[PDB]
């Protein structure tokens, strides 16, 4: 049911027109100050996870209403990939539909490894500088 390999497709091939089915692993606000929340997401395609997702603030009602939460499965309908000054490419989710609630799925799907650290095959890349989890937690 998840679009296995879609995270690599977005990050490696630049595919911006695909509509993949992903699982939300974690949601977190970018800052905790007194301001309208802006959420970052750790998403999974079942093979890899990627933490460089931001939810467009127009979609915040999905989070405030608890429709989008950890372990739910959603389909992305529109996104763009933006690059920060330091080089990091961040996927901005603009439109999405929750297909299965967190409660309905019940559990994390598969055994995904972080995209920065490993392959879609479940193995970890050679990391001679011990740095490739820098953008994960």
Author numbering: 4 to 125, 550 to 564
Copied sentences from the primary study:
The heterotrimeric Replication protein A (RPA) is the ubiquitous eukaryotic single-stranded DNA (ssDNA) binding protein and participates in nearly all aspects of DNA metabolism, especially DNA damage response. The N-terminal OB domain of the RPA70 subunit (RPA70N) is a major protein-protein interaction element for RPA and binds to more than 20 partner proteins. The RPA70N domain adopts an OB fold with a five-stranded anti-parallel beta-barrel but has very weak ssDNA affinity. Its primary role is to mediate protein–protein interaction with its basic and hydrophobic groove and a side pocket, as first shown by a series of studies of RPA70N interacting with p53.
In the structure of RPA70N–BLMp2, BLM residues 550–564 are visible and the peptide is bound by two RPA70N molecules. The C-terminal part of the kinked BLM peptide fits onto the RPA70N groove, with F556, I558 and F561 making contacts with the hydrophobic patch of RPA70N, while RPA70N residues R41, K88, R91 and R43 form salt bridges or hydrogen bonds with BLM D560, D552, D562 and the main chain carbonyl group of F561. Interestingly, the N-terminal half of BLMp2 latches onto the α1 region of a nearby RPA70Nb. K16b from RPA70Nb forms several ionic interactions with BLM D554, D557 and D559 to neutralize the negative charges. Q15b also contributes to the interaction by forming two hydrogen bonds with BLM D557. Near the tip of the BLMp2 peptide, Y551 fits onto a small hydrophobic surface formed by A9b, A12b, I13b and I21b in RPA70Nb, its main chain amide group also forms a hydrogen bond with the carbonyl group of E7b. Overall, it appears that BLMp2 promotes Loop 12 of one RPA70N dimer to interact with α1b of the other RPA70N, and that each RPA70N provides some of the binding surface for BLMp2. Using ITC, we found that BLMp2 binds to RPA70N with a relatively weak KD of around 18 μM, and that mutation of BLMp2 residues (D560A, F561A, D562A) almost abolished the binding between BLMp2 and RPA70N. Not surprisingly, mutation of the conserved arginine residues in RPA70N (R31, R41, R43, R91) significantly reduced the binding of RPA70N to BLMp2 and BLMp1.
